[PDB]
Amino acid sequence: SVYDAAAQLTADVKKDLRDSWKVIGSDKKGNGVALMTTLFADNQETIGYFKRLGDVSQGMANDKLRGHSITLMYALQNFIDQLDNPDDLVCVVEKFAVNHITRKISAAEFGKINGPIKKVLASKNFGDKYANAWAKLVAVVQAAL
Amino acid sequence: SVYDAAAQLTADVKKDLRDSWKVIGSDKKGNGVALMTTLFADNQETIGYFKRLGDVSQGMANDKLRGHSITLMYALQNFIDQLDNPDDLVCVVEKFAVNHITRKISAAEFGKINGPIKKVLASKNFGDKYANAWAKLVAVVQAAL
Ligand code: HEM
Numbered sequence: 001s002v003y004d005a006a007a008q009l010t011a012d013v014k015k016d017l018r019d020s021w022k023v024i025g026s027d028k029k030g031n032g033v034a035l036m037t038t039l040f041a042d043n044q045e046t047i048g049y050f051k052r053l054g055d056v057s058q059g060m061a062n063d064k065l066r067g068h069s070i071t072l073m074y075a076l077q078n079f080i081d082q083l084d085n086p087d088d089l090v091c092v093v094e095k096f097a098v099n100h101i102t103r104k105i106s107a108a109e110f111g112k113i114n115g116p117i118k119k120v121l122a123s124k125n126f127g128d129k130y131a132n133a134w135a136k137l138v139a140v141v142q143a144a145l
Numbered sequence: 146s147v148y149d150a151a152a153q154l155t156a157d158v159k160k161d162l163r164d165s166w167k168v169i170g171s172d173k174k175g176n177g178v179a180l181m182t183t184l185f186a187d188n189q190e191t192i193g194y195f196k197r198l199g200d201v202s203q204g205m206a207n208d209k210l211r212g213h214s215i216t217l218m219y220a221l222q223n224f225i226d227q228l229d230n231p232d233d234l235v236c237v238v239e240k241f242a243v244n245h246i247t248r249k250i251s252a253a254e255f256g257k258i259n260g261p262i263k264k265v266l267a268s269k270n271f272g273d274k275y276a277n278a279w280a281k282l283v284a285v286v287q288a289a290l
């Protein structure tokens with residue numbers, strides 16, 4: 001249940017999400033591309049789904065990948081801004097879930113993003129505590145897939 | 146080209162875009178839904194394109210419409226944040242252009258959003274100068290359609 005998953009975002013979890021996002025969200029282009037390139041590097045079997053972006057190994061040099069990566073960061077900005085209202089968080093999560101359901105992305109494969117998130121957080125000196133908080137937000141999307 | 150249309154946005158236009166967005170963008174849910182409902186009220190012929198959202202006359206109560214409307218406002222937030230780097234603006238504009246090209250939305254049809262934009266701006270006392278500024282930004286997307 002997406003509603004039960006959303007209920008897992010307690011005061012402490014929301015605080016950790018906000019605190020880490022203040023830093024990570026300050027460079028959407030840089031960290032967004034870092035998140036994607038890490039996903040492709042550690043989970044090569046997911047590259048096939050991104051055929052529209054072309055040669056993803058080009059990283060920042062690939063215009064389609066950069067446009068996609070920046071936009072992905074605004075989806076996370078959206079989630080963070082809706083943390084105060086569960087009903088609004090759920091409706092935006094369901095909107096993005098559809099974007100992935102149509103691409104045949106399962107809850108299990110969506111969850112592969114947790115590894116890259118932990119690595120990007122770690123590079124900014126945010127440890128397991130923060131990685132786990134983000135895993136709980138990702139779990140809300142998984143509940144909708 | 147799209148780059149030409151983006152590189153043409155002047156300092157004054159960018160200032161008017163940012164000043165009006167500071168206000169309109171501060172209530173993404175309220176103004177996002179108002180923008181969409183106004184589009185449907187004045188251009189009823191576009192309703193059919195949004196069948197995925199269900200009964201759009203339900204307004205704020207329609208969770209699918211609310212989720213879509215909030216997300217649309219973050220696409221605009223994205224555009225506003227990339228104003229000083231045409232290269233970044235172009236790659237995000239092209240990303241969203243694809244989202245509309247796949248739905249067979251022509252450049253002329255996309256321009257139908259200018260009427261609703263003018264009305265939403267007017268609700269907060271932003272006049273024709275501001276509506277003209279926004280039409281120039283919409284024109285950047287039209288260059289990609
Ligand atoms: C933090 C997690 C993630 C977020 C917030 C997210 C967000 C997004 C957004 C905003 C889009 C654009 C939707 C559209 O315009 O249609 C997108 C596209 C896509 N996502 Fe994700 N995504 C995430 C993780 C993943 C993962 C882990 C996979 C695959 C295992 C995945 C697969 C896709 C695919 C295949 C596309 C389509 C790309 C294209 O052809 O343009 N996403 N995602």
Ligand code: HEM
Nearest residue numbers: 099191194195197216217220221244248250254255257258
């Ligand atoms: C300020 C201008 C506009 C912006 C920023 C914008 C933004 C968006 C965004 C972000 C989406 C979601 C894309 C996706 O997830 O696949 C969307 C979907 C869509 N847009 Fe727009 N849009 C605008 C104007 C228009 C206009 C004027 C029309 C039609 C006359 C239009 C028709 C559509 C349709 C049919 C969808 C698909 C809805 C669905 O089934 O989920 N858009 N738009």
